[PDB]
Structures are given as C-alpha cells and as structure tokens.
Design a protein around this ligand. Structure first.
Ligand SMILES: [K+]
Ligand SMILES: [K+]
Ligand SMILES: [Mg+2]
Ligand SMILES: [Mg+2]
Ligand SMILES: [Mg+2]
Ligand SMILES: [Mg+2]
Ligand SMILES: [Mg+2]
Ligand SMILES: [Mg+2]
Ligand SMILES: [Mg+2]
Ligand SMILES: [Mg+2]
Lengths: 293, 82, 396, 136, 136, 112, 49
C-alpha cells in the first residue's frame, strides 16, 4: 500500500463514512424448514393420504390398500453475485472496499434465498381466500386458516406484504387495546408479540415488496402471481404450515454461503465472489393458503 | 469490473474528495474552463462541485498596494462582527 | 451503591471497527517474516520469554489428599499446567499481536482436566452485550478456499486482553493495527531502498557510438558493438582498441545515504512499537550511556511490568480459578498469583545487593531474590544470619 | 447510462464480465459506455454512425489526450441503445454515443449481440463479439 | 455424444480448451454439444439452420427452465457433425442438434472452424470463433 | 484495604494514565449482589462530562455512548460517581485540563 | 541412451492444481519437457521380424 494522502489528528481529517442503501427483509431460514443437502439434486419422499377402512362381510378376504409413495425432487440452482476492482481502488478508497463488497455479496445471496422461497410459497400454495376488498384484516387471516383447515392441514406461520401489514395494523381488532387485549400493536406495530401469535399462527415473517420474482430483474424469469396488496387480484399474505415448505440449501464447501476473495494472477484486479445453491419445494401445497385483494 | 476513474467509483476515491476540496479553495469563480484543465474538470467532476470562489480565503484576505497600517493579510471573516 | 454498571459503554458497531479482514491482515504481517515480524517477536520474548512461577498465599494451609496422595494448591496447579512457560509465551505473544488471546478449557474422556487449549485468534471475534461484556464468539475459517463459519457461547471459552482501550474494554487493541500505517511506511521505504540500490548503487557501462553530428548508427549496428563490450563476456583485465568515434562512458554509482534512511525507518518503527532503538540493530551516540541509557531501560522495564501484571491477573482470574473450581478439591477463592519473570534482571547486580544488605534479609528472602529453593528448616529460612554461618556456629 | 434509486442517480457499472481490456489514448473527450474506434496510432475516438468503426467501449470519462481503459470483444457490457432492442438482435455503434440495431443501420454486420432487451434511450445488456475497421 | 473403449461407452468432454464459459436459462430441454441461440432475455434455445442463431454450445444436459453453461468464442470443442468435415472447413448449426458445413448450408459465414476432420455422425474437434444474431 | 483493592497496581496505572490523557479519570463504586464491596469501576472518560454549580463543584455527570442504534444519552448524579483530576487549571478547579487538547498545536505541528 | 528431462522450475513433472474462483472450477494440469537421444547408437540392436 501507498496512500496519496495522510490523515492528521484531532479529527481535522476528511469526512470518512458511507451511507447505506435500502436493505431487504430476510426471513426464509426462519420461516421454512431448512434442509442442508448432501447433493445439489435430491428427493423428499411423501407418503399418500389417510383413507377409511372398508366395510366387509364376515369371513370375506380383506382387500389390500397399502401405503404408497412419491417424491418431491429438489434441484438446487447456483445463485451467484460477484465484484471486481483494480488494486489502485483498494489502496485509495475512503473505506475498505473488500469489506463492503463482501457484505454486499452476502446480502445479495440472502435476498436470493428469500426470492426463491417467496416465489415458491406464493405460486404453489393450493388454497386461496379472496377478500374482494371488504374484511381484509384479522377476518382474512382467520378465513385463510379456515381454507387450510378445510384441507385437513394446520398452518402455523404467515408471510406478509408491506401493504397487508398496513391494512392489518389499521384493523380495529388490533388497533384498539379493548379488542386486542393489549396495546402492543398500537405502540410497537409489527414488533408486538400478538402479531406473531394471531389466528392460531405462532410465527409472522415480514417480507419486502421487491422479494417476489416479477421477472423484471436480470437473470430471473417471473412467478405466476402478483405479490402486493394494493389492487384487485394481488396476493399479499400466505398462511401456511412451516414444516411443509422446504428450503433446500446446498454448498460444495461447508453448510452455507461461500464467499471467496481473490486476486487476478495477471492484471492487478482483486474481486470477491459469492456462491450458494438453493431450491424451495412444498411437501404439501394443501397446507398453504394465499390472501387475495 | 470497476476502476478508480469509473463513474460509479468516484465517491470512494480519497483523491476525488481532496481535489474537489482543492478546486473549491483555489477558484475565484464558477467559470471552470478558465481555471482548470479539461482533464481536471472531467476527472474530478468539477461541474458538480459547488465552485464559486466563496471558499477561497483570498476572496476575504485584504491585499492593498500600500500597507501603512499592517492591514494586509487580515481576513474579514475572522473579525469581531463576523 | 449499585450492583450493576449504571454508566454505559461504547458498544455493538452502530465502519471504523474491527473485522475478520483486519484479523487476517495481522496474520499476514506475522507470517510474512522479515524485520517487522522479528521486532514483534522480540517484544513477545521480552514480555513472556523468561518463564513463570505460581504462588499461593497460605499454600501450606491448603495441604490436602487429592487422589490418595498429599498436595498443596501450588503443587496441584503445577501439575494442572506442567509446561506453563510455553503457554504463557504463546498466549502472551498472541495478546500482543492480536486484540486478545482466546481459547478453550478441555477435559480427558474420564472428565479430569486435560489442558487450556488456545484457539487461532485470527479466526475468532467477540460479540458483546450493550454493557460491553463478551456474550458470544463468532468464528470463520478457510476450508477448501472458502470461509466455513460457526458461533460459540462465551460460557466455556476464555480470553485475555493486554492492550485495552479502557479498563472496561473486553475487546482490546492490536498493536499491529494501532501502528498499521507505521508498518506500511517501513515496508514502503524498505522496498524503495532495495530498488534504488539495484538501479543506482552500482556503476553501469554506457557505450556511445558514432561522431556527434556525424553518421547515424541504427539498432542492427549497435548489436555488433554490444557483442564487443558485453559485460557478460568481459573479464577484469579486458582491453579495448577503437577509432575516435566510440566513447566508453559510465553511469556512475550515484550516492545516496540508504544507511541513514534505514536508521530513520528503524527509529520510527521501533519507537512506534515501543521498543528501544537498540532492538533494531541501530545505535545512537547520546543514548548509549549514563542517565540517557538508564531512562530508556527504565521505560522498557515499566512497559514489561504493566503487560505482565495485566496478563497475570486475567490468566489467574479467567483460566486458573475456573480450573481449580471445576476439576480440583481445593478452594478456588484462595490467594493464587502468577509471577512472570524479569527478562533483564542481572543476577550479579542482585549478588552485589545481597553482599551489601543481606544482614537485613531473612534467608528465605535471599533465596527468593537469588532464584533458589527456600531452605528446608523453617528456622534457618526465617533467620537473618546466613545458613553457612548457622552451620559453622552449630558445629562450634 | 444511469439508474434511479429514490432521490439518487447512480452510474451503471459498464463492464459485466470479461478480461479483454486494454489501454489507449483518447483522440477527443469521451464518456463512459461510448463505442470507440482507432483514429491514430493507439489513439481512439467516438465511433461514427455505420460500419467500419468499432474497437470497444470506453470504460470511464476522459478529456482529450488522456489514457483510456477500453473493453473489447469477449466482454459483456451494459450499454445505452437509441432504439428498442430485443434478445438476439445484433447491435452497432449509433454515431450518437449509443448503440442501435444492425437492422436499423445502413450496415449488415454487428459488433455486439443483445442478451437483455431495452426501450429507446435505455440500458441493455450485450456481449461484444467483433470489431470493425476500414475495409473499403 | 459418445466414445467407445472395449465394451464401454463414455460421454465425451465437450470442452477441449478455453475459459469463455457463460450462464443462461434454458428455454427448452437441451443436450450436451447442441448449438444454442438467444430465445429471450438471458434465455437460450437450440439453434435452427442457415445462420443468425448461434451464441455457443450447451456444455451439459438440462431440462427446460434450468440454468445452463455455454461455451462461446475462443473455445476449442468436441461437437457432432451431420456430414463429412475436414480441417479448415467452416461449420455452423444444422438445425438438428448437429453442425454442418457452411458449404452445405444456405449461409455464407460459419461460427466454428474444424481442426480435426470427422465422418457424418462422428465427433469433430472445432474452434468457435463467431456468434451470429438477428441482423435482419 | 489490601483485600478490598487486590489489583490496585493495575487500577492506579489505568486511572492515572486516563487522568493524564483526559481532564479527569472517573468511575463508580460497585457492590456484590449481597451488598458488600465489589470494586471501584472506572468508566470510559471520553463518554462523560461534568455539570458544575456556581461554586465550581460537580453536581451531575452527562454521558453519551455508541450503540447499534446510534448514540444513547443519559444523566447521572455526582453522588455515586467519583472522579480524579491531575491537571487542574487552579487549586479550585474540579473539571481539569486535557494536556492533549492543551498541546493540540504542538501535536499537529509534529504530525505535519 | 539418455532420456533428457527439463523443467524451468524444480526438477521433474510440474503438476499444478488450481481453482478458478470466477467459474468454480478446479483445473489439474501437468507438463514436462522431454527429449531422448543415444550417445552411442552402435550400443544397440533391434530384432526385426
Ligand atoms: K441511420
Ligand atoms: K440445408
Ligand atoms: Mg430425483
Ligand atoms: Mg382370493
Ligand atoms: Mg386406497
Ligand atoms: Mg383446499
Ligand atoms: Mg416502541
Ligand atoms: Mg548523413
Ligand atoms: Mg468471459
Ligand atoms: Mg485459450
């Protein structure tokens, strides 16, 4: 290293900070069952549904109706993000460029996991509650739980859009301490313990707007729905069983995101790269319902 | 890939700050073409620095031809009523 | 008064803080060798290289059957830590290089104490609570070219900080990072001198061909002249015969005082790292003798005492006491003290002192100063006349 | 070529992938992302409107006579197009500092191929596969 | 494409040399050694015949919608040809997963040069030197 | 006292060093849970400043400190803190002088 | 009969294993420079069918 400018004492120095950009909400590791896979492709075996025993005559042969099996396949895709800078930038930077690019690459992979998770979760949920405007608050969550219960599964988690959160915290059930049994939503909004303990659900996972795959982002081909809660037909929450949606993470080295800093052997470039492989799959899509505007 | 001159990287270069600080301190007017190289105007994005001569100390230091009273070198922005 | 801190501390990184990249900068300075590494290695050897001694006050009062055999707590601790000199040197070195030394307690399969085992400090960094006490340790390690990563509770690790920012600081300061710019300035000037010696330290031959304002000479002509005056095939007593239009000029060796630049660089780095100039193989006229010498060696010895006490207290309080509590029949609240020896004590100066004022010292105090086992008979140990005098008196 | 995020404008990173970058002298003032061509010995200038004038794209803003980093063929780049473009379209220097399609130009062979479509006046992503000079 | 040793059949390594390997989404199911072109934004599909549709060769078998690795320019490759080819023949996508010669096709310019000759249905060794897109 | 202050050699070097750098060293008294004496606990002197009355004596301490959520601020009474000043302006001064701020020009001239 | 082996660095076969972090690929390469020469070709006889 050879810095062109020296730093003097008593903080008479240059102003030496960077202001952060927008940071997206990261929840998929907590809001789903995580499988740390041994192979980049694989299978989860699924047993067939329960049936009813058959009425039969006395002394007649008992028919077979044994358990039968299928799989859901995972086929993890390598998400990658990289950066390259000349060594003159590293030497002359206001702050550590390698540290900043490492943090950016780590964040870009986490955002990647969350996009894969949310897009599977929203598109492949088998039930729906259409609010048609009207009773969009607690009654919609209760109704969406009803739609999953009517398929004989019990949901325990919900994933929510910013527009849906805004509607929900205006609901008189939650906004009035009389009706909520606590003033926690009025005071602390999404950080209220009741928001993670509502309609029988025991976890709330708050998403960002940009997370769902619109297909407008480069390298991504979009999902089938609109993620939102602003307009006719948007899907703005998913109510589901956390144990029945699998996020499968595969990495060839270690369990998780791999970040590699490297120097170019020829050209006085340094870079940092991140890899992870992820897939997301419902075991039972019937265990899940979207809420529609 | 990014280079120190590449447009998205300029705010991270210590030298881009330091030279914009110099440009503000050495100018007498917003007329960059008269006072700086085309290379400096481009390299340091001097169009976007608030260069106007208001930060140059010589805008405020007195420099009269004859100095009977030791008035030369006094800076108006250091006086009691400033 | 309160039973918890009511004053806050600076906490939890709300840039301008420690990272694992800085930890690997320290690792790179340590393993890249050369003069900088050797100075910081000498700093470790001065602070911790002279070895240690374990004391307990009222050690006799501790005497207990441990495992069908009698021991004192000192005897048990010396068996719990057989090679403590090597551990003290390793941890003490690490706690000078890095912001902290850090490690595990470990057990045999039977569950008896095995050892205190350090962990590689460039791999680990702490997470504190708001009151600034370490609650967890975050660890990342290279395996197969990527950072395989985990987190550990602060319950069963231990850590030691020599260089604190404040008396409350559990995170500490690396003296490498503290002097990162001085280290870089040193390495920069060192590389500059090496390159300048190659270019300018030796004469070089400049053969000039053709007459001034005469016929021009082309590259393919200079090739044949090159074969004649080639330094690679020339020998010491080669002689040349030429026409008037060949000049054998010389680029002289061009004088510059690289010795003075080396001395200046070494002065900057040694003073920045707190070593005396003499550790860098550099001398100075006004400083080698008298009160100018006595002051700088006083400063060095004081710096060593401060580091030694800071280490000793934490090692007793955060390694030894937990080990006594969890694996020993003794009382862990006992008055344990870890002494670390003085690296610059002259035994001949101590001998002069004993010869002058021994008449005022118990034989145990003499044995302590002289670095010997104390006498076996308590009365001879306690007495002030020398044991050779008591033996001749008793024979008489 | 720029991206908006709230109040802010950010310059786009011109070079997506590639190692084929080389140093030249600016024959005139140039802006980041402009297509350029050889105009003297190791000297590059902004490409004119049809074929026969492309070596690569300029990576950073320069005054006349400054050293230029250039991205050549084998590079993937973010470049502004002056017309609407779609994947597989071959594109060519437009003469305006932008690119345009081979289909729109008077020429019949491109220098880059569009990987990610864009509207008029907007950043596409393209792979530079060729250079063009004076054939007569 | 396949190599035989004794009773055994082995898959051939499609890539002989080069570092110009790039990532796309498959627009359909693809097989190792097939030529492909841009069917959409960062999406590739099997090349049709007679030029204007070639970005590179698919490096391994993939299903529709999977990410795919592709060898482009500056790569030496082992590829199946639908006719006899000889060294110095220019070749291009055949519309049948194979390559054929420029001479046989309706096109006038190739995308790879044959380095080692081969019979119809055999694997030749070739060097990729050009992409082809929509020129109109 | 030797049992109450077992590591006094360290505390003296920390407080004394702080009182040469900063205008004061400053700290708490702390108790064990049972309410017996634990230690005299130094505080981070750059985080604390005294409020004094017209007679010159300290009445309260104002503190601010970095946290993950930016700066946290609080005020404490002079009752349960204690402080030490080596570098007094006058025998009646109980706020003191930083020798470092006092010599700012000499330090900056050396660096330049 | 002399098998002449040459390596610009070291003494024998260079085998390089490297990873390219841009493509997530390990390359394994190896090289040696070799010639073979008789010093005395009279010191050998082929057996011919
Ligand atoms: K035109
Ligand atoms: K045909
Ligand atoms: Mg399978
Ligand atoms: Mg039967
Ligand atoms: Mg059945
Ligand atoms: Mg249903
Ligand atoms: Mg609150
Ligand atoms: Mg002539
Ligand atoms: Mg490439
Ligand atoms: Mg090659």
């Amino acid at each position: 290293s050879d810095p062109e400018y020296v730093d003097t004492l008593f903080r008479e120095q240059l102003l030496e900070v960077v202001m952060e950009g927008r940071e997206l909400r990261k929840v998929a590791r907590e809001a789903s069952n995580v499988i740390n896979a041994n192979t980049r492709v694989g299978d989860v075996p699924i047993a067939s549904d329960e049936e009813f025993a058959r009425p039969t005559g006395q002394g007649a042969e008992i028919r077979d109706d044994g358990e039968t099996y299928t799989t859901v396949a995972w086929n993890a895709t390598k998400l990658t993000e990289g950066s390259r800078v000349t060594d003159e930038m590293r030497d002359q930077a206001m702050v550590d460029l390698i540290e900043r690019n490492i943090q950016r690459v780590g964040a870009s992979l986490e955002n990647g996991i969350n996009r894969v998770f949310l897009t599977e979760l929203v598109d492949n949920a088998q039930n729906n509650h259409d609010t048609a405007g009207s009773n969009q608050g607690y009654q919609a969550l209760n109704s969406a739980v009803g739609e999953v219960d009517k398929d004989d599964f019990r949901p325990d988690t919900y994933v929510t859009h910013p527009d849906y959160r805004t509607q929900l915290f205006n609901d008189t059930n939650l906004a009035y301490a009389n009706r909520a049994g606590t003033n926690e939503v009025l005071r602390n909004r999404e950080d209220a313990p009741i928001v993670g303990d509502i309609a029988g659900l025991d976890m709330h996972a708050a998403m960002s707007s940009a997370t769902y795959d619109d297909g407008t982002d480069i390298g991504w081909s979009g999902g089938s729905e609109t993620w939102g809660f602003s307009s006719d037909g948007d899907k703005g929450a998913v109510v589901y069983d956390r144990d029945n949606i699998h996020t499968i993470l595969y990495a060839p080295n270690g369990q998780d995101v791999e970040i590699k800093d490297y120097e170019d052997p020829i050209r006085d470039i340094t870079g940092v790269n991140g890899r992870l492989h992820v897939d997301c799959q419902y075991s039972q899509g019937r265990s899940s319902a979207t809420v529609q505007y | 890939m990014q280079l120190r001159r590449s447009p998205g990287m300029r705010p991270m270069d210590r030298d881009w700050h330091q030279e914009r600080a110099r440009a503000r301190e050495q100018a007498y007017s917003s007329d960059l073409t008269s006072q700086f190289s085309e290379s400096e105007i481009v390299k340091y994005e001097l169009d976007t620095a608030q260069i106007d001569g208001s930060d140059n100390p010589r805008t405020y230091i007195w420099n009269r031809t004859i100095d009977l009273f030791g008035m030369n070198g006094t800076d108006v922005r250091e006086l009691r009523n400033r | 008064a309160s039973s918890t801190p009511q004053t806050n501390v600076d906490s939890m990184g709300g840039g301008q803080d420690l990272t694992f990249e800085d930890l690997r900068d320290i690792k790179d300075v340590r393993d890249s060798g050369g003069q900088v590494a050797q100075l910081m290695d000498y700093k470790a050897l001065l602070n911790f290289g002279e070895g240690c001694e374990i004391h307990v006050e009222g050690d006799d009062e501790t005497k207990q059957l441990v495992d069908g055999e009698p021991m004192t707590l000192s005897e048990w601790l010396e068996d719990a830590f057989p090679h403590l000199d090597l551990l003290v040197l390793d941890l003490g070195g690490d706690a000078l290089w890095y912001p902290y030394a850090v490690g595990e307690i470990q057990e045999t399969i039977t569950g008896e104490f095995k050892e205190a085992l350090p962990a590689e400090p460039w791999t680990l960094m702490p997470e504190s609570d708001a009151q600034g006490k370490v609650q967890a340790w975050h660890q990342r390690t290279k395996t197969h070219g990527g950072y395989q990563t985990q987190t550990l509770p602060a319950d069963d690790l231990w850590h030691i900080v020599i260089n604190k920012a404040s008396a409350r600081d559990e995170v500490g300061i690396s003296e490498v990072l503290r002097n990162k710019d001085e280290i870089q300035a040193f390495k920069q000037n060192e590389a500059a001198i090496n390159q300048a010696i190659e270019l300018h330290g030796f004469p070089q031959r400049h053969v000039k061909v053709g007459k001034e304002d005469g016929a021009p000479v082309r590259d393919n002509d200079l090739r044949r002249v090159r074969t004649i005056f080639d330094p690679r095939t020339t020998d010491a007593n080669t002689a040349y015969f030429t026409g008037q239009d060949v000049d054998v000029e010389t680029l002289e060796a061009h004088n510059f005082d690289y010795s003075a630049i080396h001395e200046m660089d070494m002065r900057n780095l040694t003073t920045a790292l707190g070593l005396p100039l003499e550790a860098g193989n550099v001398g100075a006229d006004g400083l080698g003798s008298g009160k100018p010498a006595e002051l700088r060696f006083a400063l060095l010895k004081l710096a060593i005492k401060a580091n030694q006490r800071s280490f000793s207290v934490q090692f007793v309080e955060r390694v030894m006491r937990p080990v006594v509590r969890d694996y020993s029949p003794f009382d862990h609240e006992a008055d344990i003290r870890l002494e670390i020896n003085d690296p610059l004590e002259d035994i001949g100066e101590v001998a002069d002192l004993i010869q002058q004022v021994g008449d005022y010292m118990t034989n145990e105090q003499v044995a302590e100063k002289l670095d010997l086992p104390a006498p076996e008979d308590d009365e001879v140990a306690d007495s002030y006349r020398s044991p050779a005098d008591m033996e001749k008196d008793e024979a008489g | 070529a720029t991206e908006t995020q709230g109040e802010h404008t950010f310059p786009v990173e011109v070079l997506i992938s590639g190692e084929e970058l080389r140093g030249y002298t600016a024959g005139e003032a140039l802006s980041a992302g402009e297509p350029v061509y050889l105009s003297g010995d190791y000297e590059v200038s902004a490409s004119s409107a049809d074929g026969g004038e492309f070596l690569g794209v300029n990576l950073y803003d320069v005054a006349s006579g400054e050293p230029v980093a250039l991205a050549g063929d084998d590079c993937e780049v973010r470049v502004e197009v002056s017309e609407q473009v779609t994947a597989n379209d071959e594109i060519l220097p437009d003469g305006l500092g932008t690119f345009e399609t081979v289909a729109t130009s008077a020429a019949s062979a491109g220098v880059a191929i569009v990987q990610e479509g864009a509207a008029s006046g907007e950043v596409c992503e393209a792979y530079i596969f060729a250079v063009q000079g004076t054939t007569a």
